Amino acid sequence: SSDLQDKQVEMLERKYGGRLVTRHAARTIQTAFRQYQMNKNFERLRSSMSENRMSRR
Amino acid sequence: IAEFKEAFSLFDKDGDGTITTKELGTVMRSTIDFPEFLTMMARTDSEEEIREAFRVFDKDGNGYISAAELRHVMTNLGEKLTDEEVDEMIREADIDGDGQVNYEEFVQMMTAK
Amino acid sequence: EFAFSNDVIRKRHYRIGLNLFNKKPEKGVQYLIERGFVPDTPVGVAHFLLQRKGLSRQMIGEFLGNRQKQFNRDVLDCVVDEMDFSTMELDEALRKFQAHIRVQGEAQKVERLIEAFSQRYCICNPGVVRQFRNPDTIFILAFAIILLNTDMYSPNVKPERKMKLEDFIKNLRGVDDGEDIPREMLMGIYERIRKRELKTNEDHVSQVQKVEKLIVGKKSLHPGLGCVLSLPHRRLVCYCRLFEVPDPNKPQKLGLHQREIFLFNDLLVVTKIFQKKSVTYSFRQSFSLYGMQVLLFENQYYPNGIRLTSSVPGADIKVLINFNAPNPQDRKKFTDDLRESIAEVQEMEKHRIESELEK
């Protein structure tokens, strides 16, 4: 249920220390990873311009 | 040391321990009181913060994190990653393939300028 | 033969469809379609997502950015076809697009959203497109604008590492089949983004986030509120001032135990004022609505009593908390809202049980 997931998240956060410390550590990792993936996909996209994406088919 | 107290005092024209907010920028490039200003002077790079963040999840100070554990945290806490995002993370972060994530290597992999 | 009258039950199921969308978008649109709240067509769903309040713009973006499912792709096509980017600068057009839709998160979803956006921009601006050697340059530049906006405004990129104007320009060097995008085009884009961060329009999640900030205060390796309030489906229902009553069978002083109550669609939050000058609150307790019941009471000590109990199937019956409202009208309004939200949560869980007991 919805209460069960909220308690599971709470326990997961307390497992590694103060809840706010664990949560911020995870977000710190996730934010760096998502910007890293965005940078990589941008380099991937500019490296292949001969696919004519802008013609919608 | 208090070399910043002398630049503050130069803008403290009536000697009441305050500098104007108009010159607040002019002072740094060289009402707000001194306790406030000594804070703005004392007031970490991305590499270190990310290492510390991973260290929170390495409870035993081992230098690695289980792939199943990293997945559990990444998909359930904070900005919840997707499973395919975590698959990409583990592919590059599990250097040996045993299911243990060398996060110190991964940190530099990410912040590789 | 005619439209369904929007009575209490019909309104409730509509809100349930929105809740389900904000939890699992594909299940939400299925629920809304099969009950006749939205037409069973890509264009009907597209205009619903753009026009109807109560939808998380984060979740709209996750739904539209799905590249694997044909229905999602067709909806996104209709979403951008509803927008006119004619005679706008690319970053201005992108700002208009992302005002409706959160363009953030998983890189594959961001790319999918920018692709549809860019194809539409090209259709709307054939003259702009012809200036380039490769029309895909528009798509690459739109992606770079998203990257730039994050770079410029994301604390996780230190200012010494942030892209200056020339970094932005040089990073795009040669992208138009070996040629540069015209320097002045990149310069105007950079300055417009520097003047105005791209921001998505507010939604109900925005408004819950503002409540979180009122309860936390002004904070860090541990920001925020222990209680996770601002989930994408959670919305504020009402705020109420009440007085907590530790023991309904004994009197207490007027004004004692004052509480500021925040009722959400699936959660009741009890706070006490912290400071006022404009008001901040101290978190005290939260209660899930599943299994909750709302009792009114009046006795020699409390004329406007409320008792909340917990009666979870398979569990015993438990008193959660007692209140006394300032007046009968306040008690009626709050308990009516609370009862309605409890009924909504009960159908949610009921729907989820039938879901699991058939998959």
From Swiss-Prot, chain B:
GO biological process: autophagosome membrane docking; calcineurin-mediated signaling; cellular response to interferon-beta; cellular response to type II interferon; detection of calcium ion; G protein-coupled receptor signaling pathway; G2/M transition of mitotic cell cycle; long-term synaptic potentiation
Chain residues that bind Ca(2+) 2: 31, 36
Transmembrane intervals: none
SUPFAM superfamilies, sorted: EF-hand
Modified sites of kind N6,N6,N6-trimethyllysine: 80
Modification Phosphotyrosine occurs at: 64, 103
Modification after translation: Ubiquitination results in a strongly decreased activity. Phosphorylation results in a decreased activity.
Subcellular location: Cytoplasm, Cytoskeleton, Spindle; Cytoplasm, Cytoskeleton, Spindle pole; Cytoplasm, Cytoskeleton, Microtubule organizing center, Centrosome; Cell projection, Cilium, Flagellum
Residues holding Ca(2+) 4: 94, 96, 98, 100, 105
Cross-link Glycyl lysine isopeptide (Lys-Gly) (interchain with G-Cter in ubiquitin), sequence positions: 13
Numbered residues of crosslink Glycyl lysine isopeptide (Lys-Gly) (interchain with G-Cter in SUMO2): 13
Residues bearing the modification N6-methyllysine: 80
Domain remarks: The N-terminal and C-terminal lobes of CALM bind to the C-terminus of KCNQ1 in a clamp-like conformation. Binding of CALM C-terminus to KCNQ1 is calcium-independent but is essential for assembly of the structure. Binding of CALM N-terminus to KCNQ1 is calcium-dependent and regulates electrophysiological activity of the channel. The C-lobe interacts with KCNN4 channels in a calcium-independent manner, whereas the N-lobe interacts with the S4-S5 linker of KCNN4 in a calcium-dependent manner playing a role as calcium sensor and gating the channel.
Family of this protein: Belongs to the calmodulin family.
Protein's name according to its UniProt entry: Calmodulin-1
Organism of this sequence: Homo sapiens (Human)
Gene it is expressed from: CALM1
Curated annotation (Swiss-Prot), chain C:
Residue ranges that the Swiss-Prot or TrEMBL entry lists as coiled coil: 329-359
Any single GO BP term: dendritic spine development
Annotated family: Belongs to the BRAG family.
Disorder named in the UniProt entry: Intellectual developmental disorder with short stature and behavioral abnormalities: An autosomal recessive disorder with onset in infancy and characterized by intellectual disability, developmental delay, short stature, aphasia, and hypotonia. Additional features include seizures and behavioral abnormalities, such as inattention, hyperactivity and aggression.
PH domain sequence ranges: 257-347
Protein name according to UniProt: IQ motif and SEC7 domain-containing protein 1
GO CC annotation: centrosome; cytosol; intracellular membrane-bounded organelle; membrane; nucleoplasm; postsynaptic density; synaptic vesicle
Domain SEC7: 3-196
Subunit structure: Interacts with ARF1 and ARF6. Interacts with GRIA2; the interaction is required for ARF6 activation.
Broad class of where this protein is predominantly found: cytoplasm
Tissue expression from the record: Expressed in brain, ovary, heart, lung, liver, kidney and leukocytes. Moderate expression was also detected in lung, skeletal muscle, placenta, small intestine, pancreas, spleen and testis.
Source organism of this protein record: Homo sapiens (Human)
Phylogenetic classification of the source organism: Eukaryota, Metazoa, Chordata, Craniata, Vertebrata
Full-sequence range covered: 517 to 878 of 963
GO molecular function: guanyl-nucleotide exchange factor activity; lipid binding
Keyword Ubl conjugation: no
SS bond partners: none
